[PDB]
Structure formats: C-alpha cells, structure tokens
Amino acid sequence: EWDREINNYTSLIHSLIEESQNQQEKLEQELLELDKWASLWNWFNITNWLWYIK
Amino acid sequence: YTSLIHSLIEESQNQQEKLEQELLELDKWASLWNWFNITNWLWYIK
C-alpha cells in the first residue's frame, strides 16, 4: 500500500539531502585547496618582487 | 569570484533547507495516513 510510497519518498528526500551535502563539502574542499595554492603563488610573486629591492 | 562563489554554497544550502521542509511536510502526511490505518485496523479487529 501507500506506506511503500511514503517510505520510498522519505528515503529519496534523504538521498537528495545527502547529495546536496556532499556537493557542499566538495565545494568547500575545492575552495580550501585553491586558497592554499593561491597563497603559495602569491608568496612566489611577492618573493620575486622583493628581489629588486637594493 | 567573492559574490559569485558565495551564491553557490548558498544555493546548495537553500536546496537542503527546502528538502528538509519537504521531509517535515511528508512526515506530517505519514502521521495522518498512519492514524487512518491504525483506526481502520482496530475497527476490523474489535
């Protein structure tokens, strides 16, 4: 009976919430990795600029 | 950039909030339907 559908729809909503949470987590991890390398390339660029100071 | 990526995680959070509210509404429906089912069963086994 309709309890099957209710249980199925409940599980699907949970699956979607989890997929959305996983997408959020991946974006956060991507931003953290990009921030790390942005910081290292910024460091490299600054270091090159400082060389010219006599 | 700053404003654009800001909106993407916000979009994800908005989606999750909507799905959470859909679950709570579905739970209310489940409660209503279960009440009918139990009343019906008790009537038939009385």
Query: Read out DSSP for A29-49?
Result: HHHHHHHHHHHHHHHHHHHHH
Domain B1-46 has CATH 1.10.287.210: yes
Q: Positive or negative CA dihedral for A32, A33, A38, A43?
A: positive
Query: Tokens 């994800």 appear where?
Result: B12
- Please judge whether B16 and A20 are an interchain contact, meaning their C-beta atoms are less than 8 angstroms apart: yes
Min CA distance, B46 vs chain A (Å)? 22
Q: What angle do CA A44, B4, A31 make, to 5 degrees?
A: 45
**What is the DSSP-derived secondary structure letter of residue A1?**
-
Q: Is A15 on the interface with B (CB under 8 A)?
A: no
Neighbours of B37 (CB within 10 A): 13
What's the CATH class of domain A1-54?
Answer: mainly alpha
| A6: nearest CB among B5, B12, B30 | B30
Min CA distance, A39 vs chain B (Å)? 16
Q: What share of chain A is helix, strand, coil (3-state, %, to 5)?
A: 90, 0, 10
Resolution value in angstroms: 1.7
Solved using: X-ray
Q: Is B1 on the interface with A (CB under 8 A)?
A: no
Q: Helix or strand or coil: residue A6? A: helix
Burial category of B1 from C-beta neighbours within 10 Å (exposed 0-12, middle 13-18, buried 19 and up): exposed
Q: Is B30 on the interface with A (CB under 8 A)?
A: yes
